[PDB]
Each structure stands twice: as structure tokens, then as C-alpha cells.
Amino acid sequence: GSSGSSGQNVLDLHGLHVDEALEHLMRVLEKKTEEFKQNGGKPYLSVITGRGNHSQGGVARIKPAVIKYLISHSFRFSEIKPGCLKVMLKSGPSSG
């Protein structure tokens, strides 16, 4: 319905290289949570690794790595869509 605070909350990984996608997931995990605490947004973050591609080849192999990195940092996430991943941003201190 109504609209909320500005700023992208969904990060699209599909299209980039496993290496890139990963690094991005980390840079966005901290860069995103920033505004989340500064302003105030959803405690989670949308991340699209890729969908449909598999049909032909979908050899992206991005989700595989992402999932591995997540579990490592004990990052809680749920699968609501066959092409989306909901992750719960971890809370903590602030820049200042």
C-alpha cells in the first residue's frame, strides 16, 4: 500500500560473477544496515541470486556460494520465492 523511506532494499546478484556477487553481498550487508539504523527500515534485505536461467543453463552458481557464506556467519534467512532470498540483518553498534 503506502510507501516507505527511500533507498534500495533489494540487491540483484543475478548477472554478476560468483566472486563479485559475494563481495557485493558483504558490502551491501554493511552499507545497507547503515541506513537501517540511521533512518529506520526493514530488519531484512532482499537478495536475488537468479531464477529461470536454470531452464537453459543457469550455470550462475551464485546462490550456492551466498548460502555457504550466510550459514558461516549464522545469517538467518527464509525462502519465500523460487528466485528470492530473505535475510535478517544483524543488529549492533553504530558508526559514531
User: Which approach determined this entry?
Assistant: NMR
* Cell of residue 39, nine digits: 533512518
Q: Using alpha carbons only, how large is the chain's radius of gyration in Å?
A: 14
Q: Are residues 50 and 83 in contact, defined by beta-carbon separation less than 8 angstroms? A: yes
Evaluated on CA atoms 24, 25, 27, 31, the torsion sign reads positive
Q: Strands of 1-96 (E only): list them.
A: 10-12, 44-48, 77-78, 85-88
Domains assigned to the chain: 1-96 (3.30.1370.110)
Paired sense of beta strands 85-88 and 44-48, if any: antiparallel
